[PDB]
Amino acid sequence: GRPEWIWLALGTALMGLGTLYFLVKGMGVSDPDAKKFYAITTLVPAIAFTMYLSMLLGYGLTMVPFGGEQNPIYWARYADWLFTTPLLLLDLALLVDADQGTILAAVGADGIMIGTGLVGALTKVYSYRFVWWAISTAAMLYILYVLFFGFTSKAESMRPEVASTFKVLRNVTVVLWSAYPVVWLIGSEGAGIVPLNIETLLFMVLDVSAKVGFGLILLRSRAIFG
Ligand SMILES: *C/C=C(C)/C=C/C=C(C)/C=C/C1=C(C)CCCC1(C)C
Ligand SMILES: CCCCCCCCCCCCCCCC
Ligand SMILES: CCCCCCCCCCCC
Ligand SMILES: CCCCCCCCCCCC
Ligand SMILES: CCCCCCCCCCCC
Ligand SMILES: CCCCCCCCCCCC
Ligand SMILES: CCCCCCCCCCCC
Ligand SMILES: CCCCCCCCCCCC
Ligand SMILES: CCCCCCCCCCCC
Ligand SMILES: CCCCCCCCCC
Ligand SMILES: CCCCCCCCCC
Ligand SMILES: CCCCCCCCCC
Ligand SMILES: CCCCCCCCCC
Ligand SMILES: CCCCCCCCC
Numbered sequence: 023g024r025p026e027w028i029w030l031a032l033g034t035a036l037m038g039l040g041t042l043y044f045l046v047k048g049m050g051v052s053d054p055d056a057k058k059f060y061a062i063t064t065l066v067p068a069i070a071f072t073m074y075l076s077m078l079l080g081y082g083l084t085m086v087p088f089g090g091e092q093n094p095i096y097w098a099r100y101a102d103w104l105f106t107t108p109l110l111l112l113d114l115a116l117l118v119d120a121d122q123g124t125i126l127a128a129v130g131a132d133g134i135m136i137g138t139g140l141v142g143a144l145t146k147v148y149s150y151r152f153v154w155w156a157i158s159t160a161a162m163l164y165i166l167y168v169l170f171f172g173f174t175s176k177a178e179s180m181r182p183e184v185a186s187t188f189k190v191l192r193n194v195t196v197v198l199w200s201a202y203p204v205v206w207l208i209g210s211e212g213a214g215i216v217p218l219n220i221e222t223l224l225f226m227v228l229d230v231s232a233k234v235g236f237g238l239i240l241l242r243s244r245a246i247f248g
Pocket of ligand 7: 126127128129130131134157160161164
C-alpha cells in the first residue's frame with residue numbers, strides 16, 4: 023500500500039521486458055565477441071528485475087532511526103547495484119580493451135561506492151550518514167574520471183565505430199550516474215526533502231535508462247562484433 027509501489031511496479035515491468043528482449047536477441051547471435059556483450063548486458067536488467075520485484079512485494083525495506091524519526095530505507099537497491107554497476111563498467115572496459123589492472127581498480131572503486139553508500143543509508147547518527155555519502159561520492163568520481171580520461175584514451179586506439187559507440191555509452195553513464203548522489207542527498211536517505219514516492223520515480227527513470235537504455239544502444243551497435 024506504499025505510494026511508491028506504482029514506480030516499483032513500472033520498474034519491474036521495464037527491467038523484465040528489457041531482459042526478455044536482450045535474451046531473445048542474444049540467443050540468436052553466433053559471434054563469440056557479441057555473445058559476451060549480450061551475456062553481460064542481459065544479466066544487468068535481469069538482476070534489477072529481481073530486486074525491483076522483491077521491493078514491489080515488500081522486501082528489501084528497513085526502518086532506520088535518524089533525525090529523531092523512523093525512516094524507511096530501501097536497502098535492496100544496493101544489492102542490485104553491487105552487481106549491476108560493475109557489469110556496466112565491464113561492458114565499457116571490453117569495448118575499449120581496457121587493461122586488466124584498470125578494470126580491477128574501477129570495479130574495486132565501484133564496490134567501495136556501493137558498500138559505503140549502503141553503510142551511509144543505514145547509519146543512525148545523521149551527520150555521519152553524510153560522511154559515508156561523501157566517501158561513496160568520491161569513489162564514484164574516481165570511476166567517472168577513469169571512464170572519461172582513461173577509457174576514452176583506450177577507445178582512441180579502436181576503430182572509429184567502436185570509439186563512437188563507447189563515447190555515447192560513456193556519456194550516458196556520466197550523465198545518469200552523476201545524478202544518483204544528488205537524489206540520495208536530497209531524498210529519503212539524506213535531507214528528506216524529496217518524498218520517497220518521487221525519489222522512487224527518479225531512481226526508476228535513472229535505473230531503466232542506465233540499464234535498458236544503455237543496453238539498447240550497445241546491443242544495436244556493430245561495435246560488439248568480432
Ligand atoms: C543500474 C543502476 C545504476 C547505473 C546505479 C548507479 C548508482 C550510483 C552511481 C550510486 C551512487 C551513490 C553515490 C554516489 C553516493 C550515495 C549512495 C550511492 C549508492 C547512491
Ligand atoms: C593528473 C591529475 C589529476 C586529477 C584529478 C582530479 C580530480 C578530480 C575530480 C573529479 C571528477 C570527473 C570527475 C569527471 C568527469 C567527467
Ligand atoms: C501498473 C503497472 C505496471 C504495469 C505493467 C505492466 C506489464 C507489462 C505490459 C507489457 C506491454 C507491452
Ligand atoms: C533470464 C536471464 C538472464 C540471463 C542471462 C545471462 C547470461 C548467462 C551467462 C552465461 C554465458 C557465458
Ligand atoms: C561544521 C562542519 C562540518 C562540516 C563540513 C564539511 C565538509 C564538506 C566536505 C565534503 C567533502 C566531499
Ligand atoms: C569548525 C569546523 C570544521 C570545519 C571545516 C571544514 C571543512 C572540511 C573540508 C573537508 C574537505 C574534504
Ligand atoms: C584496487 C582497489 C580499488 C581502489 C581504487 C582506488 C581508489 C579509490 C577510491 C575511492 C575512494 C575514496
Ligand atoms: C527543477 C527543480 C525544482 C525543484 C524544486 C525543489 C523544491 C522544494 C521544496 C520545498 C519544500 C519543502
Ligand atoms: C512531502 C512532500 C512534498 C514534497 C515535495 C517536494 C519536492 C520534491 C520536488 C523535487 C523533484 C526534483
Ligand atoms: C492493485 C494493483 C496491483 C497491480 C500490480 C501490478 C504489478 C506487476 C507488474 C506488471
Ligand atoms: C526472465 C527473468 C527471470 C528471473 C528469475 C528470477 C526470479 C526471482 C524473483 C524473486
Ligand atoms: C567527525 C567526522 C570525521 C569525518 C572523517 C572522514 C574521513 C574519511 C576519509 C576516507
Ligand atoms: C512533485 C513534483 C516532482 C515531480 C518531478 C518528477 C519528474 C521526473 C522525470 C524524470
Ligand atoms: C573504505 C573506506 C573506509 C573509511 C572509513 C571512515 C569512517 C568514517 C566515520
